[PDB]
Every structure is written in C-alpha cells, then in structure tokens.
Design a protein around this nucleic acid. Structure first.
Ligand SMILES: [Mg+2]
Ligand SMILES: [Mg+2]
Ligand SMILES: [Mg+2]
Ligand SMILES: [Zn+2]
Ligand SMILES: [Zn+2]
Lengths: 106, 63, 908, 114
RNA sequence: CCCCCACAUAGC
RNA sequence: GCUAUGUG
C-alpha cells in the first residue's frame, strides 16, 4: 500500500525531467496546484504559495514560472476574499498566510 | 527513455486509483484520458507534458 | 438530322445525340444473362443501341433517354405483337416501332428511359470496389441522395466511420419501392395478357418501367406465368440496404404523412405480414409462412426468416421480445413469458403452460427466475440517452458505473530488462501492449457498438445454395443430443449469469440439480421458449488498442441446455485433425507445421490470402447466425423431430441473439449479433466464416464473363452454378459435391473462429474464377454492412515464408533436426508487455511468477530462430530471469532451453 | 441440502419481486388483452411509476426533460430528483449552460407518473 | 462488487 | 483437484 508511492517516487527520480522535479520540489516546500495543469495556451491555473521565500523563488515579477513554463499572473486571493494586487505585497509588508494565484499559459 | 515514461504513468495511475480518486468521476475521466494518450503516444514531448498533468493531479491532494 | 427528327416523333421532345449519330453507341453495363452459352450476373458491352438524351428548355441535361435498339425483323414483329398486348399497363415504357433507310432496317425506339437500369444499381451495391464507384456516384448524384461534393470526404462509403451513408441510401429506398410496385403491376399485366417469360433486372428502368419483350412467349389469356425468382433474389440485399419499405410505417403509405400509432398491446401482425407479401412479392412462387413454427424443414425456416427480416422493420419495436401472461400460483398473480415474438421467426407460443399449479419445484422456479418477465415487470422505466439501443427497464434506483483498473507494474522484470540492454531508443522491440484503463461510461459505450448491427436480408437462393456447400464442410463429424450424465464441463467455479450470480457459481447449479432435473429442463426447452438475461462484463486483458472489450456472460439456464444440445458435435470438431476447421489443434509438437502442410496440399499456383472481420461480434446479421445454428443442428435427424429442432432454434435465438441484455443494473435489448459467452460461439463463428468464403467464391464465379473463360469445365460449372442458384428449387445434391471438390482443389482454407488463411490458385483468381480480396470486400459490404479495409488484409506470394498473420502468430521456416519446419512466433512486444505488466498485484509473488514466466518462455521460444538479434534475445532474457528466480528459491526441468525446444519437435 | 437453501433464496426473491408489482395498471392492460398476453416491452412503459433518464450532455437535457415536467411515453412526468454520476444530489438550478462543465455528467433524473 | 464460452499449454 | 498463461 505504502511501497507503491516509494517505487513511483524512485522511478520519478530516475526520470530526471526538469518539469517533474521542479513540481515535486515546489510541492516539497508547500507550493500546491489546486486544479489540473493545462497544456493549451491561455488556460486557467490555480496554485498556492505558503510563505514568502516560496514567493521569492516561484513568483517572478509579473510572469511567474511553473512546470518549466511561464504563467501570467492575473488575480490573487489571500483566502479572506481580499483581492490582492501585484503592487500591494512586498517584503516590507510580508504579514498580510497562503495566497491563491490564478494564471494563464504564455 | 520513453518506455520509462509509460512504465511510470501506469504506476502513477495505480497510485491514483488506490487513493480513491475513482469515486470522483470527473477527475478519473481526465486521468484515464491522460494515461491512455500517454500510452498511445510515440514522442517524448507530449508524453512528458501529459506526465506533468497527471503528476499535478496527484500532487493536488496530499496523499 | 432526319433520324434525330424521326426518333422524337409525336412525343415533342428536344433531343441531342449522346453517342455518334445514326450509329450505335457502346456502353458497359451490368447484365443478368442465362443462355446455353453464358450465364451469370456480370458486366458486358451493349453494342446494339443508339441513345439520345432529352433536353429541357433551359438546355440543362435531363435523366430521360431515348434508347433505340435496331435488331432483326423477327424480334421487331415479335415485340410489336407482344407490346400491343401490353400497352395498357402503366408500368411499361413507351415503344415506338418504325423503319429507316440507312443502306430499310427495323427500329425499336423506347421513350424516357433512364441512363442506368436496376441491375446497374444492384451490381454497384453488391460488387463494391473503392475507387471504382463511378456508376454508384452517378446514381447517388442524379437522384439527390447527396451532392457531388459529398464524396470529397473520404471514408464516406464506410458504415463504421460514416454512418450517414445509410441516410444517403434511404433516399434511393423509395424509388426502389416504386420499382417493386411497378414490377407487381407488370406481373399482373403479364398474367392477364397470357404471357410467359422471365423478369430480369437489366430490363427495368430506375423509374420502374419495363422495356424488353423479346424472350416472351404468348399463351392463352389469363394463363401467363412470369418468372421472378432471379429478380427478387438478386434485389433482396438492396431492399434493406436502402430501406425500401420505410414508407409502410405511415398512415396511408405516403411519406408526406405522419406515423402509424400502432396499439401497444398488438403483437401478432400476421395479417400485416401476409398483406405486405401480397403487395410486394405477389408472384413469388414459394409459399411464405409468417410464423416459422409452421415450417417444413430448415431450408424453409431460412426462407421465411429472410422474409420476416424485411417485414419486421415496419412493425414497432415494442411488439417484439417475450410475450408475458398472468399466471396464478396458489392464487398469487405472477407474470411469466408464455411465448416470444421474433423479428425473424414470427410468433412462437409455448406449449406447456401451467396456469394454476399448487407447488413450485426447483426446475420451474429456475425457469421463472431466469425469465426477464419478472425483472422487467418489477423494475422502473428507463430512458437511456447514451445508447441508441432500445432500453426497457432499470432494475435499481442506482446506475452502475464500473471502471477498468489500470494494470499493475512489475518493476523487477523491468529493471532486469534494462540491465540486459533492452528498450534502447531505435530498437525494433519496445513496449506496445498495455493495460488500458477506462472511465465509467466504458460498458455503455462498448454496448453502443451494437448500432452496427442492421437488419440485413440475404440473397435467399444464393444463401440456400451456400448453406448446402457449408454443410459439406461439416460432414466428417457426428452430433446429437447427449444425456445429462454424458456432459463434460471444464470449470465449475464460473459465474452462472444474472440473476444466478447472487447465490452461487455454476458449481451450485450443477450440484443442486440431479441428472433427471437437467434432462427435464432440456426436454422443457425442446417444447418451450425460455428467454434469459446475459450480463455484460468488462474484459480485463492486455492490448495495443484503446478500446474496451466486453463479454456477454449467458445465464446457466441457457448454457446448461446448449451444452447437451451441441456438446457431441463440438467435441467431434475439436477432436478431428486435418479438416478445414482447426479448433482443438495444438500449435506445439509440429502441429503448426502439420496445419500449414494440410492447407498447402495440392493447389497449383499457390498464394496465401488472409482477411479479418471489422466488428465481427457486433455487425453479424441475424440470418447468418440463424444459418450457423441451423447447420450445427443439422446433426439431429435421429434424436429430434422437426418441432423439437425448431423449438431449440427458437430457444437459442431468444437466448443469444435477441436477448434482454443487462448492462450495468438496467436491461437493454440486443439488436443482434453473436454473444461471446455462448456455448457455441467459436463454432458458429467458423460456420459464418466458411459461409462468407463460399459466397465470395460464388460471387466471383458468377460475376465473370463466361465467354472470356478459357477452360470449358469451369464455364460449364458456372452455367450449372447459375442454374442451381436461380432456376431449380430442389437441392442438386451432386453439383454440391462438385462445387465442394472445386473449392477444395482451388480454394483450400484454414478456419479458426473468425481468423482464416487460404491457399488459393493464382491463375484462377487472376482470371476471376475463385475469390480474391475484392470479392471478399464486396461480400462484406452487402451482406455484413461493414467495410473490410484492404490495408489490414494481406496477400502472400512466396510459399517458403508462411502466412503473415494467423491467431496473432507470425510464421518462419527453420531447420529443426534435419528437415524444414514451420514455427509460430509472436510479436515480442506482446510477450514483453505480458511479462512486465500483470493484471493483479498478487500475481507478482515468486511462486506464481515462476509459472507465469515459464509459460511466457514456452510461448516465446521460436524467437531464437529469428534473424533479428534482439528478437532472439527476448527468450534469452526470459530464460535468464527464470534462472534468477529459480536460483533465488534435466530436459524435463524448466531452466534449460532444450525443455523449450522439445515443445516444438514433432515427436512427442 | 444447499439446494433447499438456494431454492429458499429464489423463493424469497420471487416473493419480494411480486410484492414490488402493484396490480392496478398491470391488471388493466392484462385483462384488456384479447389472447390474455402482452409484450414485455410495454409492461414498464405503461405500468411503472418511476422513470429514470440518463442524460449524457447538456444539449440532450434541453430536448428531453427540461423544467419540472416533461412528456415521455404519452404521459406526464414530475421530476422528483436529479443525481449526478458521483451519486450526489443535484438541484435543478445547477443545471445551466455556464455551469455544465462543472457538472459530473451523466445526470440521472428521477420522475414519477402524474 | 463484477469477472463468459471454447481450445491449447505448464507445475502439483 | 487447484493455479497460471496463450488464442478467438
Ligand atoms: Mg436487356
Ligand atoms: Mg476479428
Ligand atoms: Mg484474428
Ligand atoms: Zn416456411
Ligand atoms: Zn437432438
């Protein structure tokens, strides 16, 4: 029951594609997608960021990288129904935790 | 190279089916669509793109 | 311009010469010929007719033609004498008789005929070849079934890819029905005029008019007899391909009128069938029994069933199925089936019915539980929009939504395989066979493939000859009813079907009933009709395709009696070696070489040809399944009477042909086709395979020019073949042996269930004297409603390489011992995928994997002889893995390869 | 014997399956028949109370059963319940064209005879 | 929970 | 007698 996950992660490490290890080590930090990742251009993607260092790595200005692909940030929910802009959050005012971002395929 | 992609997609869908995702029909339908078009695929590119889709489906819930 | 001024006459039609003027045009049309010289249904050149097309006022071309045939003076005076006795019929084309000085020569001018006759459409649909459809395309365009840009889509002809082509042919259907009505009126005029003759298809316009009166003989008026056997018999597939009687569903048989509101309680329709027969087939000489319980022998059951197939397309689909009746047990009202209404066999009433019985013992409550009457009466009404098939009831408030689990992965064998250098990029061997997982709608999407089964008539004279030739392929066996103690059942721990799978397996029903109870149940089925319910199970296999596989597990009350009815003949077929049907023959110990040398017997110019059936389980017509069951029941002249044999046929046709199939907790009706869980499905499939091959040879021999045949024995065989089909109604029991010897000499076959390989004569097929792939394609187009793709079916020219594909095995010639031995080897991807993917995770235990891998290595031994090196290393990898596993936990011991080469040496 | 056990099981399932029938519209069409027998395919069509429609998509829903009433088999049916493929209860207001990709197709509606 | 028929093969 | 695998 439990060994099938370990065998899957063993052959996932044996695969060593950049998108796969990128997604699993973002999941190691707490960055979790809430829907199925789409491959069609201009389709919606939900993803969560749990802390600010994960925002430092994963979020990149106005277009953030995920699964070795860039995604245009549109709208952010801080799980309190407060619509967060891109100019609002900085490291000066990091207490606001995890915040849900929508995106589109470049 | 591409054979290990198919051999890990079958065990990924096995882990998903063991995590009781087949109770949800709307998720299991696109899981088996991704898995069947992985096994029918002949290239490494589309196989790895559908592989990151299926792995993102797994990493959606905690497991 | 004087001859063109003469041909118009008083009709006042603007005419232009279609061919060169004042001389005859040469066309290439299909004819139906029977002389002492040449006989058959083939294409000829017609060189005695000069044709003129009629123009409108806006000068676009019109379908009306003026076919002028100038002949001898004798036929001129004869046709004038006969046409004066036929000009008052409405269905006779206008003939203008005149003479002209081209040197006078007599001229017969016919008015407003069509470019194509009925025989052109019949030959174009019955001899169909892609890329040679110009006659069919012209007929489909000039009658607005579709415009000319419809054919730019390819796979337009295919019934499986493009099911709108049935909607295309349904616009030809009403013109065909009007031609049938005009044929009946012409036969009435011939009988009332005292004229005896034969009606051939090429003498009938596509408007329905009749125009060739040369061969007709006068008699006294009122005593004329017309001959319409070849006409209706050749026309019969077109009536259900184009759906000709679809206008009979309307209120006064007019298409611009609504449907008939038939009563829901009506089930008889016998007067309706007789009225339809006297409307459309009035001068058909044989008697028609609407209910086939009044049929003399099985060659009358085939006849009346072939008429009931056409006539049951008019009646509503609620009237068919079982006929239930209220029956009291201790004054408690039940609802049980005391009959059945068949689309093919008419109305059948049970004989032994007990309206009041105080007690219910085990046999009758088994019959009452297997009945769909109680389940479909108690359940809820169902309207399933996922399926085109007619849905009757839902047994639960829920809906079953079963899925197919993906296959478990054997990581250890994959690590061993990549340790041995397999699955490098660019090698010929890779993984292509996997367990394909399916979603919840898989069972109902697989059940919806029964929409390919269409109601299909057959050429009944041709089918009645072909059944006699197919019965010759089953002569060396013996059969008959065995007793309940003489039955042999392989696995008792199998499921007993619905609803019996709740209480136990088939072991419980074979241990609970004594032999007297089973014999009483068989005697009940010989006098009554028991309908049953077959559950659709999802097969769990490994394949290269994405499709799901569904088996139809038939209940115990059908298979228990079908075993006693068929077991002796099926065991006799499986025990006999050297015959055409090769069920029961090993491929081991030189059995593959023995089978291949049995096929390669004495054929003079041998090629090898093999074909496949597209959707054989689904698109099988009901006439051919009935014919297969009749051929298999022809071994019963001693132990069963005619009524017992008809009731066994009706039981089997009600249990495995038009059954009430339960796909996921809700009952549907099955439109037809074979069932995979039948007690006799492989052998009925073999009868159907031999039937299609024999009728492809008949269509090959009849559709060639008999003048162009060099041999005279073959030409006399063709002239006798047309006569034995369409002239005599008796079975010519010594020409059947001659045709069977001809097919054994020039068209030798190997037949397993639907897979087949033949060893045919090259110079005979290239001359068009036996069947090729083109004749198979035409036969499967008009008798099977499928398109056999030519890209799948193969032809092999060299003999020393064997057949390309038989039982999914490739063959190679190898030197084993000292003589050259044919060996079967599989695709290495199939063996590798069976090795690395298992169906259940408990099968990855070592005590089961040693057995699984030694069986896989026994199947994979003849790859070592293959010239490709990685193919040869497949068996070495399997053997090294068995060595690894056996060393973890002597030729009769299984870790050394002479054990695996002993399985293919002919001495055992 | 176990044949007595399985015959008791089949006896009880026959007894339950006859109580499931209510004999009003069954007796009407059976006793209105001329030979005493009717086709089985019209027994639930004219006798059953519940109707279950399985609808695969949204364009099939607007043609067969849209609203709270619909006419099938020459009768009026009142929609009691709509349940999707995950056996969850679905309201009638959820079924709309903008909400249709969010729904777990097929829908299994349940109707009663008026 | 469901898992057909037939034939071949292997180990006890 | 059980199990497994191939073939349709
Ligand atoms: Mg002619
Ligand atoms: Mg086939
Ligand atoms: Mg085959
Ligand atoms: Zn008859
Ligand atoms: Zn018999």
């Amino acid at each position: 029951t439990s060994a099938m996950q370990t065998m899957l992660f063993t052959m996932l490490r044996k695969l060593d594609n950049d998108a796969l290890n990128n997604i699993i080590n973002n999941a190691r930090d707490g960055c979790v997608p809430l829907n199925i990742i789409p491959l069609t251009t201009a389709a919606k993607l939900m993803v969560v960021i749990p802390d600010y260092n994960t925002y430092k790595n994963t979020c990149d200005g106005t277009t953030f990288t995920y699964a070795s692909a860039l995604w245009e940030i549109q709208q952010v929910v801080d799980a309190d129904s407060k619509i967060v802009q891109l100019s609002e959050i900085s490291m000066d005012n990091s207490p606001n935790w995890p915040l849900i971002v929508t995106a589109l395929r470049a | 190279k591409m054979s290990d992609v198919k051999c890990t997609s079958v065990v990924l869908l096995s882990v998903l089916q063991q995590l009781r995702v087949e109770s949800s029909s709307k998720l299991w339908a696109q899981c088996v669509q991704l898995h069947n078009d992985i096994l029918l695929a002949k290239d490494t590119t589309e196989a790895f793109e559908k592989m990151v889709s299926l792995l993102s489906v797994l990493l959606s819930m905690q497991g | 311009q004087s001859f063109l001024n003469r041909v118009c006459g008083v009709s006042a039609a603007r005419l232009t010469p279609c061919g060169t003027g004042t001389s005859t045009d040469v066309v290439y049309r299909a004819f139906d010929i029977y002389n002492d010289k040449v006989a058959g249904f083939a294409k000829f050149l017609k060189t005695n007719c000069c044709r003129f097309q009629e123009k409108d006022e806006d000068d676009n071309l019109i379908d009306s033609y003026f076919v002028v045939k100038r002949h001898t003076f004798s036929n001129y005076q004869h046709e004038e004498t006969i046409y004066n006795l036929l000009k008052d019929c409405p269905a006779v084309a206008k003939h203008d008789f005149f003479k002209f000085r081209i040197d006078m020569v007599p001229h017969i001018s016919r008015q407003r005929l069509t470019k194509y006759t009925m025989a052109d459409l019949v030959y174009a649909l019955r001899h169909f070849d892609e890329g040679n459809c110009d006659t069919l395309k012209e007929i489909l365009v000039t009658y607005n079934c579709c415009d000319d840009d419809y054919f730019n889509k390819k796979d337009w002809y295919d019934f499986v890819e493009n099911p709108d082509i049935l909607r295309v042919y349904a616009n030809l259907g009403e013109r065909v029905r009007q031609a049938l009505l005009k044929t009946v009126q012409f036969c009435d005029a011939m009988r009332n005029a005292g004229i005896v003759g034969v009606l051939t298809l090429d003498n009938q316009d596509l408007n329905g008019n009749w125009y060739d009166f040369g061969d007709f003989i006068q008699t006294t008026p009122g005593s004329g007899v017309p001959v319409v056997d070849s006409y209706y018999s050749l026309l019969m597939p077109i009536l259900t391909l184009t759906r000709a009687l679809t206008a009979e569903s309307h209120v006064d048989t007019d298409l611009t009128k609504p449907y008939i509101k038939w009563d829901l309680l009506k089930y008889d329709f016998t007067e309706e069938r007789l009225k339809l027969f006297d409307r459309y087939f009035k001068y058909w000489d044989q008697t028609y029994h609407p209910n086939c319980v009044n049929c003399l022998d099985d060659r009358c059951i085939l006849h009346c069933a072939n008429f009931n197939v056409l006539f049951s397309t008019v009646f509503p689909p609620t009237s068919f199925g079982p006929l239930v009746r209220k029956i009291f047990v201790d004054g408690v009202p039940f609802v049980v089936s005391t009959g059945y209404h068949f689309r093919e066999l008419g109305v059948v009433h049970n004989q032994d019915v007990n309206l009041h019985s105080s007690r219910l013992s085990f046999k009758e409550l088994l019959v009452y539980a297997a009945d769909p009457a109680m389940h479909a009466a108690s359940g809820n009404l169902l309207l399933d929009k996922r399926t085109t098939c007619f849905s009757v009831a839902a047994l639960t408030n829920n809906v079953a939504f079963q899925t197919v689990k993906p296959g478990n992965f054997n990581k250890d064998f994959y690590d061993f395989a990549v340790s041995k250098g397999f699955f490098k990029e660019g090698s010929s061997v890779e993984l292509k066979h996997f367990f394909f997982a399916q979603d919840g709608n898989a069972a109902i999407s697989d059940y919806d493939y029964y929409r390919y089964n269409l109601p299909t008539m057959c050429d009944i004279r041709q089918l009645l000859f072909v059944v006699e030739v197919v019965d010759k392929y089953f002569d060396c066996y013996d059969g008959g009813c065995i007793n309940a103690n003489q039955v042999i059942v392989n696995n008792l721990d199998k499921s007993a079907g619905f609803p019996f799978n709740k209480w136990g397996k088939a072991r419980l029903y074979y241990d609970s009933m004594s032999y007297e109870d089973q014999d009483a149940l068989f005697a009940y089925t010989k006098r009554n009709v028991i309908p049953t319910i077959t559950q659709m199970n999802l097969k769990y296999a490994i394949s290269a395709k994405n499709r799901a596989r569904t088996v139809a597990g038939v209940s115990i009350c059908s298979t228990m009696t079908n075993r006693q009815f068929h077991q002796k003949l099926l065991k006799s077929i499986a025990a006999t070696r050297g015959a055409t049907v090769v069920i029961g023959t090993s491929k081991f110990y030189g059995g593959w070489h023995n089978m291949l040398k049995t096929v390669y017997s004495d054929v003079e110019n041998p090629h090898l040809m093999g074909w496949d059936y597209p959707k054989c389980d689904r698109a099988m017509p009901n006439m051919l399944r009935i014919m297969a069951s009749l051929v298999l029941a022809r071994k019963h002249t001693t132990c069963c009477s005619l009524s017992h044999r008809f009731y066994r046929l009706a039981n089997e046709c009600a249990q495995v042909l038009s059954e009430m199939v339960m796909c996921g907790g809700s009952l549907y009706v099955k439109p037809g086709g074979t069932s995979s869980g039948d007690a006799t499905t492989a052998y009925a499939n073999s009868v159907f395979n031999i039937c299609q091959a024999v009728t492809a040879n008949v269509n090959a021999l009849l559709s060639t020019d008999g003048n162009k045949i060099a041999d005279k024995y073959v030409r006399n065989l063709q002239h006798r073949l047309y006569e034995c089909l369409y002239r005599n109604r008796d079975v010519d029991t010594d020409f059947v042996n001659e045709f069977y010897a001809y097919l054994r000499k020039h068209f030798s076959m190997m037949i397993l269930s639907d897979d087949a390989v033949v060893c045919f004569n090259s110079t005979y097929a290239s001359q068009g004297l036996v069947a090729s792939i083109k004749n198979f394609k035409s036969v499967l187009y008009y008798q099977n409603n499928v398109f056999m793709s030519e890209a799948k079916c193969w032809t092999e020219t060299d003999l020393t390489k064997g057949p390309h594909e038989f039982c999914s095995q490739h063959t190679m010639l190898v030197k084993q011992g000292d003589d050259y031995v044919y060996l079967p080897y599989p695709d290495p991807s199939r063996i590798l995928g069976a090795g690395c993917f298992v169906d259940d995770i408990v099968k990855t235990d070592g005590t089961l994997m040693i057995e699984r891998f030694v069986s896989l290595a026994i199947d994979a031994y003849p790859l070592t002889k293959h010239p490709n090196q990685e193919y040869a290393d497949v068996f070495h990898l399997y053997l090294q893995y068995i060595r690894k596993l056996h060393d973890e936990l002597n030729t009769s011991r299984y870790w050394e390869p002479e054990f695996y080469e002993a399985m293919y040496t002919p001495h055992t």
